[PDB]
Amino acid sequence: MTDRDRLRPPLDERSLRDQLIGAGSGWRQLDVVAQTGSTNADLLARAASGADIDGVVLIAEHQTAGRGRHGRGWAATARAQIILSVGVRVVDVPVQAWGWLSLAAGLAVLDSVAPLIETGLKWPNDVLARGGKLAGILAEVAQPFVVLGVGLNVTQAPEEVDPDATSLLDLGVAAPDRNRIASRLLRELEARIIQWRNANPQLAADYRARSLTIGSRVRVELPGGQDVVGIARDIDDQGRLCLDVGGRTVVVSAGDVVHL
Ligand SMILES: Nc1ncnc2c1ncn2[C@@H]1O[C@H](CNS(=O)(=O)NCCCCC[C@@H]2SC[C@@H]3NC(=O)N[C@@H]32)[C@@H](O)[C@H]1O
Numbered sequence: 001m002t003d004r005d006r007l008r009p010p011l012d013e014r015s016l017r018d019q020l021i022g023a024g025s026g027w028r029q030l031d032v033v034a035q036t037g038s039t040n041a042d043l044l045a046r047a048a049s050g051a052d053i054d055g056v057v058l059i060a061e062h063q064t065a066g067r068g069r070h071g072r073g074w075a076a077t078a079r080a081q082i083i084l085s086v087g088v089r090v091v092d093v094p095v096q097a098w099g100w101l102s103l104a105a106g107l108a109v110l111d112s113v114a115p116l117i118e119t120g121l122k123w124p125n126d127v128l129a130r131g132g133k134l135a136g137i138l139a140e141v142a143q144p145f146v147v148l149g150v151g152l153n154v155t156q157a158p159e160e161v162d163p164d165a166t167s168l169l170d171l172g173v174a175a176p177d178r179n180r181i182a183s184r185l186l187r188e189l190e191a192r193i194i195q196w197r198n199a200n201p202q203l204a205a206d207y208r209a210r211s212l213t214i215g216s217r218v219r220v221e222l223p224g225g226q227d228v229v230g231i232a233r234d235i236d237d238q239g240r241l242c243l244d245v246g247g248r249t250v251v252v253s254a255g256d257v258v259h260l
Contacts (some may be wrong), residue, residue, distance in 0.1 A: 007169070060083045067140075067149070102138075104193065122213035
């Protein structure tokens, strides 16, 4: 751990803005802060006060009260992760389509690190590698916006955050460069968001091609603490998980997947 700190230099905010903001780029604003409770909470607070957060990026070197799905947490230590939130205007898109945005986010994350490295997307949005959770995605709503949060373990050690975690460094990526990764990440997200906004079928085909969950036997932990065990067959037009339970189709809009 003490050694991993020597592989955690800070992000160059100036250089990242030079790469990501400007003509042709959807990103309107990027800031790197030293510390916050939750980048999602922060962009949601901005929007609740009237700010236009469409194409706004907030990166945090450290995150002390990270949020997960379904009232869970997200652990981080300083400079170990890429922790960021982006604002996406969604009010132009019918509400039944908004869950795709979270699927698209996980695809963006997976694609931006895949070349550096059992690996793929667990439905809905989380990125697994060698069975460990490599990145967490969390989208929340602040009309007319969705705030899309990513926490990507770059040099983060499982013993620092969670027993089931993995990171680029634990997958053997030598000394991962968070500036390079964050630029690849935010360029991938931009295209994926544009794809979502325009109902591009390539989004669904690329998600299916990256899914670890489709085809596998799963147990799905439903909101409310009921479990269903079936075989995940597909996602539908709303990105809902289609389960085969001994012949019957069960379509799940929210849940925690365990692969069996
Ligand atoms: N470091 C870490 N590595 C891997 N596993 C980790 C971890 N820490 C905790 N766990 C486990 O993962 C479970 C939660 N799983 S989840 O389904 O809720 N996934 C959704 C995750 C949300 C993404 C966070 C982003 S960061 C930018 C923005 N700002 C926020 O506040 N949120 C978003 C927990 O209970 C622990 O067991």
